[PDB]
Amino acid sequence: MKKLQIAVGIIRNENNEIFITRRNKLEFPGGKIEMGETPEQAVVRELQEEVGITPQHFSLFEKLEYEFPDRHITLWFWLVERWEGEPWGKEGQPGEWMSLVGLNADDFPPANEPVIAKLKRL
Ligand SMILES: [Mn+2]
Ligand SMILES: [Mn+2]
Ligand code: NA
Numbered sequence: 001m002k003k004l005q006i007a008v009g010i011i012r013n014e015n016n017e018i019f020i021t022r023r024n025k026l027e028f029p030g031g032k033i034e035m036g037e038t039p040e041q042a043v044v045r046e047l048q049e050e051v052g053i054t055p056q057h058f059s060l061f062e063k064l065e066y067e068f069p070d071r072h073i074t075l076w077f078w079l080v081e082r083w084e085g086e087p088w089g090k091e092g093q094p095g096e097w098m099s100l101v102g103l104n105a106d107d108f109p110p111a112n113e114p115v116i117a118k119l120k121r122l
Contacts, residue, residue, distance in 0.1 A: 005033040005074045007043035010061060010119065011053070012081055013097065018119070019051065019087045022094035026107045028077075039076045051095065053085035062115050077115050 008030035011019040020026045029050040033042035044055050061079040065072070089095040105116045 001070055001072065003072045003074065005039065005042075005076065006030060007033050007039055007046055008075060008077045009043050009047045009051075009055065009058075010077060010079050010115075011047075011051070011083070011087055012079060012100075015099070016101075017097040017099050018103070020096060020098050021050070021089070025109055026098075027109060027112070033076075040078075043076065043078045043080075047080070047083075050091050050093070051087040052090040053080075053083040053087050055080045055083050057082040062118060064111070064114070075111070 008028045010028055013019075019029070021029055029047055030043070031046040031050070033039055037045070039060075040058075043058070047053055047055055055078070058078045058080040060076065062077040064075040064077070066075075067073075087095065100120050103116055103120050105113045105120075108116060
């Protein structure tokens with residue numbers, strides 16, 4: 001029984017647009033929390049690696065858990081509202097700003113559904 005945790009960054013600007021990356025299907029920047037890192041350190045590291053920004057002000061937006069045989073997975077969704085730098089496709093992946101109003105849960109993997117609903121509201 002091992003744990004696998006992933007930190008996810010929801011980057012929102014002043015115009016209520018979120019930075020979305022692509023694979024085909026759309027998704028949020030993010031990745032695995034490594035040994036010895038806190039959830040906060042991991043989201044900062046993964047975002048610096050994937051989109052070239054350093055989160056400065058962020059809060060826990062949602063935490064989802066998945067219990068599978070021999071594996072406990074936790075997804076940490078952080079709402080990033082202020083950062084240093086400009087988001088871009090640093091790891092060579094497609095990226096772009098999309099307004100919250102126009103976000104469609106069907107364009108993201110089913111796992112993000114509850115977060116999108118919550119996001120696409122307030
Ligand atoms: Mn990554
Ligand atoms: Mn990684
Ligand atoms: Na990623």
